[PDB]
Design a protein around this motif. Structure first.
Motif, PDB file in Angstrom:
ATOM      1  N   UNK A  62       0.835  -1.206   0.000  1.00 43.34           N
ATOM      2  CA  UNK A  62       0.000   0.000   0.000  1.00 43.34           C
ATOM      3  C   UNK A  62       0.863   1.247   0.000  1.00 43.34           C
ATOM      4  N   UNK A  63       0.222   2.363  -0.317  1.00 43.96           N
ATOM      5  CA  UNK A  63       0.868   3.682  -0.292  1.00 43.96           C
ATOM      6  C   UNK A  63      -0.187   4.671   0.211  1.00 43.96           C
ATOM      7  N   UNK A  64       0.187   5.510   1.165  1.00 45.65           N
ATOM      8  CA  UNK A  64      -0.698   6.573   1.639  1.00 45.65           C
ATOM      9  C   UNK A  64      -0.186   7.950   1.218  1.00 45.65           C
ATOM     10  N   UNK A  65      -1.051   8.774   0.624  1.00 46.56           N
ATOM     11  CA  UNK A  65      -0.701  10.186   0.401  1.00 46.56           C
ATOM     12  C   UNK A  65      -1.742  11.059   1.100  1.00 46.56           C
ATOM     13  N   UNK A  66      -1.304  11.895   2.017  1.00 42.31           N
ATOM     14  CA  UNK A  66      -2.200  12.751   2.788  1.00 42.31           C
ATOM     15  C   UNK A  66      -1.748  14.212   2.768  1.00 42.31           C
ATOM     16  N   UNK A  67      -2.700  15.119   2.984  1.00 41.21           N
ATOM     17  CA  UNK A  67      -2.417  16.549   3.020  1.00 41.21           C
ATOM     18  C   UNK A  67      -3.537  17.285   3.722  1.00 41.21           C
ATOM     19  N   UNK A  68      -3.276  18.516   4.169  1.00 38.26           N
ATOM     20  CA  UNK A  68      -4.327  19.326   4.780  1.00 38.26           C
ATOM     21  C   UNK A  68      -5.094  20.059   3.652  1.00 38.26           C
TER      22      UNK A  68
ATOM     23  N   UNK B 102       3.124   9.210  -4.427  1.00 37.53           N
ATOM     24  CA  UNK B 102       2.837   7.991  -3.653  1.00 37.53           C
ATOM     25  C   UNK B 102       2.088   7.018  -4.548  1.00 37.53           C
ATOM     26  N   UNK B 103       2.512   5.755  -4.549  1.00 36.48           N
ATOM     27  CA  UNK B 103       1.820   4.767  -5.350  1.00 36.48           C
ATOM     28  C   UNK B 103       2.360   3.368  -5.171  1.00 36.48           C
ATOM     29  N   UNK B 104       2.056   2.512  -6.131  1.00 35.32           N
ATOM     30  CA  UNK B 104       2.561   1.153  -6.119  1.00 35.32           C
ATOM     31  C   UNK B 104       3.494   0.968  -7.306  1.00 35.32           C
ATOM     32  N   UNK B 105       4.528   0.164  -7.110  1.00 36.04           N
ATOM     33  CA  UNK B 105       5.506  -0.069  -8.169  1.00 36.04           C
ATOM     34  C   UNK B 105       5.089  -1.268  -9.009  1.00 36.04           C
ATOM     35  N   UNK B 106       5.981  -1.739  -9.886  1.00 32.89           N
ATOM     36  CA  UNK B 106       5.641  -2.832 -10.791  1.00 32.89           C
ATOM     37  C   UNK B 106       5.426  -4.163 -10.074  1.00 32.89           C
ATOM     38  N   UNK B 107       6.068  -4.337  -8.922  1.00 34.79           N
ATOM     39  CA  UNK B 107       5.933  -5.574  -8.167  1.00 34.79           C
ATOM     40  C   UNK B 107       4.740  -5.523  -7.218  1.00 34.79           C
TER      41      UNK B 107
ATOM     42  N   UNK C  24      -7.958  17.005   7.090  1.00 30.41           N
ATOM     43  CA  UNK C  24      -6.916  16.122   6.562  1.00 30.41           C
ATOM     44  C   UNK C  24      -7.511  15.182   5.544  1.00 30.41           C
ATOM     45  N   UNK C  25      -6.935  15.198   4.341  1.00 35.59           N
ATOM     46  CA  UNK C  25      -7.389  14.295   3.305  1.00 35.59           C
ATOM     47  C   UNK C  25      -6.352  13.169   3.163  1.00 35.59           C
ATOM     48  N   UNK C  26      -6.794  11.935   3.364  1.00 38.12           N
ATOM     49  CA  UNK C  26      -5.902  10.784   3.242  1.00 38.12           C
ATOM     50  C   UNK C  26      -6.309   9.885   2.072  1.00 38.12           C
ATOM     51  N   UNK C  27      -5.364   9.633   1.177  1.00 35.16           N
ATOM     52  CA  UNK C  27      -5.595   8.715   0.058  1.00 35.16           C
ATOM     53  C   UNK C  27      -4.769   7.440   0.279  1.00 35.16           C
ATOM     54  N   UNK C  28      -5.439   6.294   0.326  1.00 36.01           N
ATOM     55  CA  UNK C  28      -4.748   5.011   0.486  1.00 36.01           C
ATOM     56  C   UNK C  28      -4.707   4.307  -0.866  1.00 36.01           C
TER      57      UNK C  28
ATOM     58  N   UNK D 293      -3.971  -2.446  -4.228  1.00 28.07           N
ATOM     59  CA  UNK D 293      -4.261  -3.068  -5.525  1.00 28.07           C
ATOM     60  C   UNK D 293      -5.748  -3.034  -5.898  1.00 28.07           C
ATOM     61  N   UNK D 294      -6.611  -2.805  -4.905  1.00 28.87           N
ATOM     62  CA  UNK D 294      -8.043  -2.726  -5.140  1.00 28.87           C
ATOM     63  C   UNK D 294      -8.435  -1.379  -5.733  1.00 28.87           C
ATOM     64  N   UNK D 295      -7.564  -0.373  -5.597  1.00 31.20           N
ATOM     65  CA  UNK D 295      -7.774   0.963  -6.128  1.00 31.20           C
ATOM     66  C   UNK D 295      -7.406   2.009  -5.062  1.00 31.20           C
ATOM     67  N   UNK D 296      -7.932   3.228  -5.201  1.00 37.81           N
ATOM     68  CA  UNK D 296      -7.640   4.298  -4.273  1.00 37.81           C
ATOM     69  C   UNK D 296      -8.868   4.719  -3.494  1.00 37.81           C
TER      70      UNK D 296
END
Lengths: 214, 242, 199, 231, 231, 238, 212, 234, 201
Positions: free
Chosen positions: G19-25, G110-115, G192-196, G199-202
């Motif tokens: 997983x990857x989390x990108x968050x910001x105010x 922030x994201x997922x790589x090829x693996x 606070x906005x959090x994006x997770x 593989x299921x999506x965002x």
């Protein structure tokens, strides 16, 4: 421009149930001198979009001419497609940003009001290209004097009617005339609804000078 | 417009460039110029074609141009073209002198004009320059020198050469009489008159019909000078005696 | 420099002072600041002499061609638009305001202010360095429905008041009345200028 | 500016202008290049050898650099332009890579310039073919050949100009390992190959060799005469 | 006289049709795509024994995973080859990844119709390229083979034969290729077809061969390797 | 070959290339323009070559400005670019002088642009003829027509296309000077239906647009109801 | 005339195993005022890539639209969606193109790589970038980074199990550090906005912050 | 003879041979069909193959999320035009933050392709196009020509023997508006199969489909993805 | 930033620290200051990170293009000359890049120093960045051309470690490479604090 000559002060914008209300005084200031006291700083773009501009009047007139021609050009086609409030806001944002990137900006801070598909639009676009949208707006001195009053009312009642929004806008104009030294007591109130864009004025705010005897 | 294009700079089916070949036909009809190189100098001798009695004399010479302190040239073929080229050689020599603060060596000057001539043959769609030059010069690298260039932009150093009318004849006559290394300016001048007496079909040569510049060194200074009519007359006289 | 133009039913009244200055020295004390762009269209120059003259000449040329192409007397608005465009396009290079006043067969007598590229039509307009001293006076003296004679008086008075107070203004008062009939010039010399409190 | 297309395709995919440029190379004087063990030899015919012409001004064997020289055939004026271009490129390479250019590298450059002139507007193809010889940093001898079209190959022994085929036929049946054994032998081969076409054998041939490391050398009339006596 | 961008009555560009005619006079190149990899084989077509066989490059490396086999006017190919080389390196610099074979082919194919003589700028081509290419490489989709002609049309192929014997070689290709074909068989089959369509007796010196497989880089076959497959 | 370029005059002083472009407008559908007492009416016999095409495809009536309409004949692609040129002119005029461009001026400008393509071999003459109509209170009703040569004239009634010689006689017998947009819409429709060929050039649609007092100076397509009546009065009276 | 403005805001990215989390105010500021309390700083690029942008809002708007256009251009010419790593490398060159009139943006991808593993790329305004395990950017980046070093990277701790960071714990850490940054940094607040990214999506989440 | 070489040379009959020769290029191309209902716009093309070992040439390209195209004629020109279309759509989304209306994009193509038909030395684009899109005015099916002309249609067909598909198209166009996605795609396929030879038939190799509708981005179906649509054809 | 390089009998040693900063703020302790241009070519970075990363990647592109065209690997001297000329076109525009180009071509090992001013020098040993002076001291005091591989690694590790100890803008991890005839090899990635504590023991 590099040095704004004749400039307009604050511009107010409030979103309401089924429309957007925008107010601005009719003064063209030359420094601290109220030179042109009967100039309109609000322009009707199309049937669903209106625009109020603060800052350099000459730049505002240039944008008005360029925007007016765009609306005319698209209307010639008559293909059922017309610029929406959001599309106008986007175009303005790009225009201002491009000019800012060439170090030759258009010295204006604009407020875009509109109503399309049963949805009100209220966007802000400054000379640097900074653009965003909110329930209420106030440029220049209005941000510190009018914006706080608007936000206070929106914090307790997120959705207000046309009358409530009109009364609130008039309350802000009165306060602006009292505390803003570049303001004038002759303003216009533009309203956009499903019926179209209506520009009323010149209006005046009932001022109270009871504190002078205090 | 392709329709009106004459197509000046393309090859023919035999790998020939016709404009260049036809520019060369022009030249073989121009007034005869001949160059001879001696031990003590170099000379040019040109048939004049401006002969009508009402021509005024006002000028250095018809066909002999000074290029810089150390070189001259004579030209055969299209006069107005020659004016473009001779002005360009003056510009090229002065460019060199400006850059190196030295006179342009004679072969560098020749080569640089011939680059201009080859370019007209290869690109741009214009007709070539209808001009052949003979150049005489002294430089510190090779001393007395004589060159010929042609409208193809081709050039070659010579001991003696001729261009213009009856050049072929002049050349076979120079091949008979020119003495490698044994030539003096006096001898050269004599031969010029001999060759010029035979390439010109006016029997009597006449010092009004010819122009002769010589180029010598005196005290570490090149001296270019058009022979005056008296000197040419004498030169002619001297041939009659032979 | 003080310039003024007033609208009246049937035409306009344009006026100005005649002082050209270079610091504290008067380089021209009888300069005409009123220039005709067309037969019935005039302009009052203010700011930089070179700039104002350069722009006025440019506009006159453009309007002249325009007039001949359309085979009709140009509109006052067209002249103002021609000046506005030049003034706006070269706003960072030029430093002069070309006041526009005239008369056409469509909208009668109109007065336009084209300072800095911005264009606005007014009942009366004042410009130049001496205009600041007469803002209060014109606001208290101007009355709608003024006749041509009253406009010239109003203009004369205002300019005279500015000339006496402003160091960059002075000399004589050039006056021009434009109407359907034609253009009629008038010059008010030093001795015939309106007198006010000069003490 | 002239933007007319001079080199265009024909019905059977033939570029007429390029073939006309090759026709000009065929009328050029014969030039022979032989790649020897430790030496490189170039030999051009002098065609019409006049007695009033300064021999040193019309040499068809020029030097592009210390290790690279070339002989051409076809339009002499065109050759001069190409040679100058190459010379400028050699100094450019020496200034950006701090090394003497390889024979193939400059061959590639000249070939590329020739191709560029067969697909450009307003220009005609160069009417010459060139033989490029020299040595690379390691010491290996090289011999290349470019033509008007822009194609180039590495050779052991080639011949261009009028009689190129005749000289090629004789070179094939005469080029061996026992023909370039010694410097002398290699030079004799080129001279003998040049004697198959060039009339009046002797002073009608311009020879020049390039031994390993040293600068280009030019054989003199009497030096060539001696070689002819041995053949 | 017509311009280079003139359309014929059958709706085709005359110049492009003539450029396609030029490809038929070229050498024969064969490309076969299998699951093990992609093999490229082109005949060198040596015209003389003195000519060095190693100087004839018909197969070049565009990148580590992409090989190219050209056919037709070889000099024209060089320009397209460099473009392909620059495109992949540009792609690596910007995206930190390798360009796909299809993408490289697409970029190279876009220059095909970029020629004219009126609206063009100082540097435009005056005619189309007279050469067919075969791009063989391996990306994320596995081994791939692409064919591009002078008209700008590029397409993926399982097996393709370009050149003078294009017609006869293609027939032998379809009658001897299957989806389960291995690399070893592809290399042999291509050589068997090349030897049958060659006028000269095929050997280890007159032909080139390169393969690109998963993992392995672009590899050119050496004389030894070639000989092993020739038995 | 005296007729191969526009920069070449023939022996009898004619520019055949421009005349060939006029032949392209001659073999095309007919469009009409009528100048009435208070406006202009445009009518085009749009030929429907296929049933697949959508109703309103390949419009030959354009809006080059708020107060200006354009009716064309000939090469549609050429006509379309000319319409864009006209639009550019109108727009440029407003930006330079601050008001709507007068029809006469607009027509003169576009005609000069058209005339520019008839002097050189580098370009070819436009293969289309068009009409310009507009209405304003200060100008009244104005109608102009421009052809491939670049000549621009003002008209009371005009016809362009293959049946312009027959439509002119039908337009001749009318009192357009005292007529109005409302009444001229039926006559225009009627006239178009008359010149239209049945057997040859089968299947056509009627395009109608007007500008005048009725439309308050704005050029626009004639309303469906009014067009209905006009077409109903055209078929019934034929 | 200055062509820049500081509009505040903080962005944080955290990479996990899957997983990857990108968050910001969501505060947008200028000077001492608030433009709006509802201006998130994270944009969706693809189905497995998110970018957080802070700094001059004018440049943030323009840069995100340029990146969106380049993604489509890449897809059209290559027939595939740009990977997280290719987006990172392309952004570097875009930012370096304006090296003499730079975008005033602090980017965090922030994201997922090829693996399929979490990936985070941090950037400086002119383009220098690298892959990290977790990074904070923008207004309160110096308040958040040290806490991430100690809690996520286990820096300065002895005898501590270095257990892999779960999505659950990562989410609690993000909310905590942003709450602490809202107390100290005046530019951080509102929400606070959090994006997770998995593989299921965002999936997005919104947590309120202090409004003052 | 003297009139059919340059695009700027008007012939004596009032025609331009070069533009007519460029239209022949579209007629030699592989057939493709384009039709629309009330909520969808689909494109169906027959992919051609140079040989048995070659892959079928791409015929359906992506332009934007609401616009897709089908080409016929010179593929190089088709890619050229496609690039131009892609840029225009990208520009519209960058400036106005909204999809470029299909009708407006078609007009840009018309203007762009008109230019080269008037200038000496230039030539017309030798590609015919079928454009499917979905904006605020519903689904659209446009057809661009090499002579810069374009038509707004309910259904269209271009390429080799496309007249037969057109004939079929005209006969069944009355029930297109009320047709559903699966139903509408069948009609296109049926019309596309009408231009094919008696022996040959439409399979999952020579058939490419592209659909764009109310709630669906322009997607392309190749080989195995066109099985569902193929299953059911009589 | 501290980077060093020296040629000894067994090839070339390349070592760098991994600290990046923004003012007094340490932006990263794990930045990579060595680009691997190819198997036998390396480039160090110091100065402006965006300038270094961009121009060294652009050199790598040209090196790869050079290989494809000329069919051979570019020499160390020619690669350094390429970079030298590239940054000389922007002289005076405030680029900040001090790098070393290390490799092994046909003329044995090669070490060049190239900076944004256009300086290009061949040498036996070099040190760049803000901690370069400190590295020089250690390196020069312990350098011998006949150093063994293990001894060369130690010197490199010591020079960088001490520079990080004294220079505020240096620190993190020491990344070291060893250029050999058959290509370079990555030696280690030792945290400088672990090293420093053991050196003080």
């Amino acid at each position: 421009t590099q040095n704004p000559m004749v400039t307009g002060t604050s511009v107010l914008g409030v979103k309401f149930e089924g429309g957007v209300v925008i107010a601005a005084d009719m003064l063209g200031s030359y420094g601290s001198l109220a030179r042109f006291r009967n100039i309109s700083r609000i322009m009707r773009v199309n049937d669903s979009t209106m625009l109020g501009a603060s800052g350099d009047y000459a730049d505002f007139q240039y944008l008005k001419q360029v925007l007016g021609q765009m609306v005319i050009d698209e209307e010639l086609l008559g293909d059922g497609h017309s610029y929406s409030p959001r599309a106008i806001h986007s175009w303005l944002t790009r225009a201002m940003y491009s000019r800012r990137s060439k170090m030759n900006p258009l010295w204006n801070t604009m407020v875009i009001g509109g109503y399309a598909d049963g949805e009100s639009f209220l966007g802000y676009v400054d000379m640097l290209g900074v653009a965003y949208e909110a329930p209420s707006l106030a440029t220049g001195y209005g941000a510190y004097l009018a914006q706080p009053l608007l936000r206070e009312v929106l914090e307790k009642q997120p959705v207000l009617s046309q009358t409530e929004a009109r009364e609130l806008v008039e309350r802000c104009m009165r306060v602006l005339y009292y505390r803003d030294a570049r303001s004038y007591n002759r303003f216009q109130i533009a309203t956009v609804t499903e019926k179209g864009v209506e520009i009323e004025g010149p209006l005046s705010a009932e001022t109270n000078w009871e504190i002078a005897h205090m | 417009s392709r329709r009106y294009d004459s197509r000046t700079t393309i090859f023919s089916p035999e790998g020939r460039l016709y404009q260049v070949e036809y520019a060369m036909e022009a030249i073989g009809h121009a007034g005869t110029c001949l160059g001879i190189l001696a031990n003590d100098g170099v000379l040019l001798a040109a048939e004049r074609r401006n002969i009508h009695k009402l021509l005024d004399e006002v000028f250095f010479s018809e066909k002999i141009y000074k290029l810089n302190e150390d070189m001259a040239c004579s030209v055969a073929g299209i006069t107005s073209d020659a004016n473009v080229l001779t002005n360009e050689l003056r510009l090229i020599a002065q460019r060199y002198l400006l850059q190196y603060q030295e006179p342009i060596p004679c072969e560098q000057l020749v080569t640089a004009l011939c680059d201009i001539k080859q370019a007209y043959t290869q690109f741009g769609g214009k007709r070539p320059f209808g001009v052949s030059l003979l150049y005489i010069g002294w430089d510190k690298h090779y001393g007395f020198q004589l060159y010929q260039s042609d409208p193809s932009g081709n050039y070659g150093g010579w001991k003696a050469t001729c261009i213009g009318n009856n050049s072929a004849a002049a050349v076979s006559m120079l091949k008979q009489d020119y003495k490698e290394g044994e030539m003096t300016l006096k001898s050269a001048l004599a031969l010029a008159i001999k060759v010029l007496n035979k390439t010109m079909d006016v029997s009597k040569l006449s010092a009004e019909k010819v122009e002769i510049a010589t180029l010598t060194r005196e005290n570490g200074k090149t001296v270019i000078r058009v022979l005056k009519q008296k000197e040419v007359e004498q030169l002619i006289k001297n041939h009659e005696e032979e | 420099t003080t310039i003024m133009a007033v609208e009246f039913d049937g035409g306009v009244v344009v006026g100005s002072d005649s002082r050209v200055s270079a610091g504290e020295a008067v380089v021209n004390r009888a300069f005409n600041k009123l220039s005709p762009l067309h037969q019935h269209i005039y302009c009052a120059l203010s700011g930089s002499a070179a700039d104002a003259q350069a722009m006025a000449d440019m506009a006159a040329y453009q309007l002249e061609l325009h007039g001949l192409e359309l085979e009709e007397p140009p509109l006052v608005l067209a002249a103002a638009n021609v000046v506005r465009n030049i003034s706006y396009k070269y706003r960072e290079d030029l430093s002069a305001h070309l006041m526009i006043a005239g008369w056409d067969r469509r909208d009668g007598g109109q007065v336009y202010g084209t300072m800095g590229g911005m264009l606005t039509r007014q009942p009366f307009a004042i410009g130049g360095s001496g205009s600041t001293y007469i803002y209060g006076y014109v606001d208290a003296a101007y009355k709608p429905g003024m006749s041509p004679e009253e406009c010239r008086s109003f203009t004369t008075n205002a300019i005279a008041l500015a000339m006496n107070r402003d160091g960059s203004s002075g000399g004589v008062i050039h006056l021009v009345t434009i109407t359907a009939a034609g253009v009629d010039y008038q010059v008010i010399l030093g001795n015939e200028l309106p007198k006010f409190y000069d003490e | 500016s002239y933007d007319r297309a001079i080199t265009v395709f024909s019905p059977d995919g033939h570029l007429f202008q390029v073939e006309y440029a090759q026709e000009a190379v065929k009328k050029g004087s014969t030039a022979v290049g032989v790649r020897g063990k430790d030496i490189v030899v170039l030999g051009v015919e002098k065609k019409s050898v006049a007695k009033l012409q300064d021999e040193r001004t019309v040499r068809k064997i020029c030097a592009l650099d210390d290790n690279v020289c070339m002989a051409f055939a076809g339009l002499t004026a065109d050759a001069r332009i190409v040679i100058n271009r190459a010379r400028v490129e050699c100094q450019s390479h020496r200034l950006t890579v701090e090394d003497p250019v390889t024979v193939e590298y400059i061959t590639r450059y000249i070939a590329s310039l020739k191709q560029r002139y067969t697909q450009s507007n307003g220009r005609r193809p160069f009417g010459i073919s060139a033989l490029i010889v020299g040595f690379d940093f390691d010491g290996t001898p090289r011999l290349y050949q470019t033509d008007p079209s822009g194609t180039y190959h590495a050779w052991k022994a080639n011949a261009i100009g009028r009689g190129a085929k005749s000289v090629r036929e004789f070179l094939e049946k005469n080029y061996t390992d026992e023909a370039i054994e010694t410097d002398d032998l290699t030079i004799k081969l080129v001279i003998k190959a040049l004697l198959e076409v060039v009339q009046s054998g002797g002073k009608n041939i311009e020879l020049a060799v390039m031994r390993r490391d040293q600068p280009l050398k030019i054989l003199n009339p009497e030096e060539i005469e001696k070689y002819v006596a041995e053949i | 006289d017509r311009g280079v961008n003139t359309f014929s009555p059958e709706g085709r560009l005359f110049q492009v049709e003539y450029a396609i005619e030029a490809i038929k006079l070229g050498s024969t190149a064969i490309g076969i795509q299998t699951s093990e990899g992609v093999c490229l084989a082109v005949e060198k077509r040596i015209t003389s024994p003195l000519m060095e066989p190693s100087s004839i490059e018909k197969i070049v490396e565009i990148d580590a995973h992409i090989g190219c086999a050209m056919s037709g006017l070889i000099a024209d190919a060089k320009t397209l080859i460099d473009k392909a080389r620059v495109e992949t390196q540009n792609h690596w610099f910007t995206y930190n990844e390798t360009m796909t074979v299809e993408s490289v082919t697409q970029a190279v194919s876009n220059l095909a119709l970029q020629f004219g003589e009126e609206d063009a700028d100082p540097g435009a081509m005056s005619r189309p390229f007279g050469v067919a290419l075969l791009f063989g490489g391996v990306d994320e989709k596995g081994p791939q083979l692409f064919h591009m002609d002078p008209s700008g049309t590029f397409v993926q192929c399982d097996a393709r034969a370009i050149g003078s014997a294009s017609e006869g070689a293609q027939s032998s290709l379809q009658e001897v290729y299957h989806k389960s074909m291995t690399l070893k068989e592809a290399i042999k089959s291509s050589l068997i077809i090349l030897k049958q369509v060659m006028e000269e007796k095929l050997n280890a010196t007159n032909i080139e061969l390169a393969t690109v497989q998963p993992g392995q880089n672009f590899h050119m076959f050496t004389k030894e390797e070639l000989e092993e497959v020739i038995k | 070959g005296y007729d191969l370029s526009a920069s070449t005059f023939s022996p009898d002083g004619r520019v055949f290339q421009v005349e060939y472009a006029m032949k392209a407008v001659e073999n095309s559908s007919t469009a009409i323009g009528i100048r009435c007492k208070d406006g202009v009416v445009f009518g085009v016999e749009k030929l429907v070559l296929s049933k697949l095409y959508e109703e309103g495809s390949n419009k030959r009536l354009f809006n080059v400005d708020r107060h200006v309409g354009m009716a064309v004949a000939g090469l549609l692609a050429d006509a379309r670019s000319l319409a864009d040129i006209a639009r550019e002119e109108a727009s440029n005029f407003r930006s330079n002088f601050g008001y709507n461009i007068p029809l006469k001026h607009l027509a003169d400008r576009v005609a000069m642009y058209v005339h520019a393509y008839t002097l050189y071999s580098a370009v070819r003459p436009f293969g289309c003829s068009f009409m310009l109509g507009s209405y304003s209170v200060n100008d009244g009703a104005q109608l102009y027509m421009i052809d491939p040569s670049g000549v621009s004239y003002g008209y009371w009634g005009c016809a362009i296309g293959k049946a312009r010689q027959a439509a002119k006689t039908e337009i001749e017998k009318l009192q357009m000077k005292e007529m109005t947009c409302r009444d001229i819409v039926k006559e225009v429709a009627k006239i178009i239906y008359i010149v239209h060929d049945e057997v040859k050039d089968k299947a056509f649609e009627l395009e109608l647009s007007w500008v005048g007092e009725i439309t308050k100076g704005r050029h626009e397509i004639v309303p469906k109801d009014i067009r209905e009546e006009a077409e109903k009065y055209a078929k019934e009276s034929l | 005339f200055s062509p820049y403005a500081f509009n505040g805001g903080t962005v944080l990215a955290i990479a996990g195993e899957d997983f990857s989390i990108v968050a910001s105010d969501t505060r947008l500021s200028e000077g001492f005022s608030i433009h709006t309390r509802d201006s998130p700083k994270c944009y969706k690029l693809t189905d497995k890539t998110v970018i957080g942008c802070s700094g001059f809002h004018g440049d943030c708007l323009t840069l995100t639209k340029i990146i969106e256009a380049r993604l489509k251009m890449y897809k059209h010419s290559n027939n595939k969606t740009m990977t997280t790593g290719a987006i990172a490398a392309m952004l570097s060159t875009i930012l370096y193109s304006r090296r003499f009139f730079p975008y005033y943006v602090y980017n965090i991808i922030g994201g997922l790589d090829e693996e399929g593993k979490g990936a985070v790329y941090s950037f400086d305004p002119v383009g220098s970038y690298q892959r990290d395990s977790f990074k904070a950017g923008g207004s309160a980046s110096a308040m958040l980074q040290p806490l991430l070093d100690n809690q996520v990277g286990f820096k300065n701790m002895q005898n501590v199990e270095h257990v892999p960071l779960s999505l659950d714990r990562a989410m609690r850490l993000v909310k905590d550090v942003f709450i602490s940054a809202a107390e100290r940094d005046v530019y951080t607040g509102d929400a606070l906005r959090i994006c997770i990214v998995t593989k299921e999506g965002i999936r997005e989440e919104t947590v309120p912050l202090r409004k003052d | 003879n003297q009139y059919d070489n340059d695009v700027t040379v008007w012939s004596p009959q009032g025609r331009i041979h070069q533009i007519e020769y460029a239209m022949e290029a579209v007629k030699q191309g592989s057939a493709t069909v384009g039709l629309k209902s009330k909520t969808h716009a689909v494109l169906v093309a027959l992919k051609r193959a140079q040989s048995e070992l070659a892959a079928h040439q791409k015929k359906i390209l992506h332009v934007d999320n609401h616009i897709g195209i089908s080409i016929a004629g010179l593929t190089a020109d088709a890619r050229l035009l496609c690039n131009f279309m892609r840029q225009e759509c990208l520009d519209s989304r960058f400036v106005f933050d909204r999809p470029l209306p299909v009708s407006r994009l078609v007009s840009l193509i018309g203007s762009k392709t008109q230019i080269p038909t008037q200038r000496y030395g230039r030539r017309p684009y030798g590609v015919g196009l079928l454009i499917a899109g979905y904006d605020d005015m519903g689904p659209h099916i446009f057809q661009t020509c090499p002579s810069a002309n374009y038509f707004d249609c309910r259904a269209m067909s271009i390429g080799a023997r496309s007249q037969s598909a057109r004939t079929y198209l005209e006969r069944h166009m009355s029930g297109f508006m009320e047709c559903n996605l699966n139903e509408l795609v069948k009609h296109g396929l049926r019309a596309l199969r009408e231009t094919l030879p008696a022996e040959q038939d439409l399979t999952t190799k020579n058939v490419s489909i592209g659909i764009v509708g109310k709630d669906l981005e322009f997607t392309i179906y190749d080989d195995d993805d066109v099985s569902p649509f193929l299953e059911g054809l009589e | 930033t501290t980077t060093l390089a020296f040629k000894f009998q067994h090839g070339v040693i390349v070592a760098v620290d991994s600290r990046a900063t923004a003012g007094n703020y340490i932006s990263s302790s794990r930045v990579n200051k060595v680009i691997e241009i190819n198997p036998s070519l390396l480039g160090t970075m110091s100065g402006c990170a965006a300038d270094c990363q961009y121009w060294e990647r652009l050199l790598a592109k040209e090196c790869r293009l050079y290989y494809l065209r000329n069919g051979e690997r570019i020499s160390v001297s020619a690669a350094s000359k390429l970079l030298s000329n590239m940054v000389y076109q922007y002289r005076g525009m405030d680029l900040s890049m001090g790098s070393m180009i290390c490799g092994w071509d046909k003329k044995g090992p090669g070490l060049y120093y190239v900076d944004q001013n256009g300086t290009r020098l061949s040498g036996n040993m070099f040190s760049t960045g803000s901690g370069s002076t400190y590295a020089y001291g250690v390196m020069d005091s312990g350098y011998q051309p006949s150093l063994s591989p293990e001894e060369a690694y130690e010197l490199g590790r010591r020079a960088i470690t001490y520079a990080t100890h004294r220079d505020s803008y240096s620190g993190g991890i020491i990344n070291m490479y060893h250029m050999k005839e058959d290509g370079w090899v990555k030696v280690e990635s030792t945290d400088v604090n672990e090293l420093l504590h053991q050196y003080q023991e």
